[PDB]
């Protein structure tokens, strides 16, 4: 069976401009486990990005947390870009600090 990823993009801590924080992209509910996840800064891939060890839920779908240290600003835009066999094109989800 194949299952499409769900994506949430959010910060570890309450976001405040000028204060160091972590940007998270939580990808879940997908199958199979091969997946591509990038964090973007103003559309450009961030090089320092780590992720959690692959695990899965009761229904056997996988989840991963991808994350990077960042300092939010008023002007800089952040996003997560996911590709997976179930997606026609990469899926991009913008970071919204209200969410």
């Amino acid at each position: 069976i194949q299952r499409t990823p769900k994506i949430q993009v959010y910060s570890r801590h309450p976001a405040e401009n000028g204060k160091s924080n972590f940007l998270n992209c939580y990808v879940s509910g997908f199958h199979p486990s091969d997946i591509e996840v990038d964090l973007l800064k103003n559309g450009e891939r961030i090089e320092k990005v780590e992720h959690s060890d692959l695990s899965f839920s009761k229904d056997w779908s996988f989840y991963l947390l991808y994350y990077t240290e960042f300092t939010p600003t008023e002007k800089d835009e952040y996003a997560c870009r996911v590709n997976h066999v179930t997606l026609s094109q990469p899926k991009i989800v913008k970071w919204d600090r209200d969410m």
Binding site: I1, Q2, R12, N24, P32, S52, D53, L54, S55
Partner: protein
Amino acid sequence: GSHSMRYFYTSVSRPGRGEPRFIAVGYVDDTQFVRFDSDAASQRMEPRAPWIEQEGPEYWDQETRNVKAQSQTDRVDLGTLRGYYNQSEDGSHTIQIMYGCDVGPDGRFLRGYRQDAYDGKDYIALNEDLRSWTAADMAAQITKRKWEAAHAAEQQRAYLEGRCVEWLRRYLENGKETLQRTDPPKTHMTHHPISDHEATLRCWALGFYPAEITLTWQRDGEDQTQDTELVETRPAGDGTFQKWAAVVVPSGEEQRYTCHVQHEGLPKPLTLRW
């Protein structure tokens, strides 16, 4: 005060070249404490929690031997299942295994689990009595007959009621400062106009542990699900979790709405109001 230990194994064949990619992770409740990845450099079971680092070389040697054996088992079983399903050697397939034990506040065995998947669907699972198996299809029925004749369930049962419980108890003691702590949610509400006449109220829960939580809205004291939205509980990345729930309300009527928060860390549910 109840607790669980679980291991999760994922094996993915790669016909284009080499052995399957194998990843094993161990958890106590919502805290990861060990990992093995066949593609990492150590070729060892590795610590992922500070409190397991005190175990001695003998511990790591035993865990490494057993987890490497399991990777080879999964390799073999990937080939057998490909044949049961009459599949080509060309494609990638996945075996997943979860097992582990639950204990009560008293430290004693409550429940055991062992279940297996193939390509993301149920394959075979040990039933709650730890004496019988559920096989999803005619492929898994083959496995079931072999495992019954080998008396696999007895051996599984002995581990789940035995060493699983005993090591979970040891880890809860050695890691008690974090593992036996509950962190209740840090809660607050935000307010977001949608128009001159409507606004979003968002009830936030941050920094809690364990992950299980319930956020509910009421209007004038009665549950409300219409016009609500919620996100799935998500990891903060620092061993805590986050969640929010929101409701759209007529501007001016905010005080009719309450967010109710249930968490193991809270002796009484919390109520928030704008």
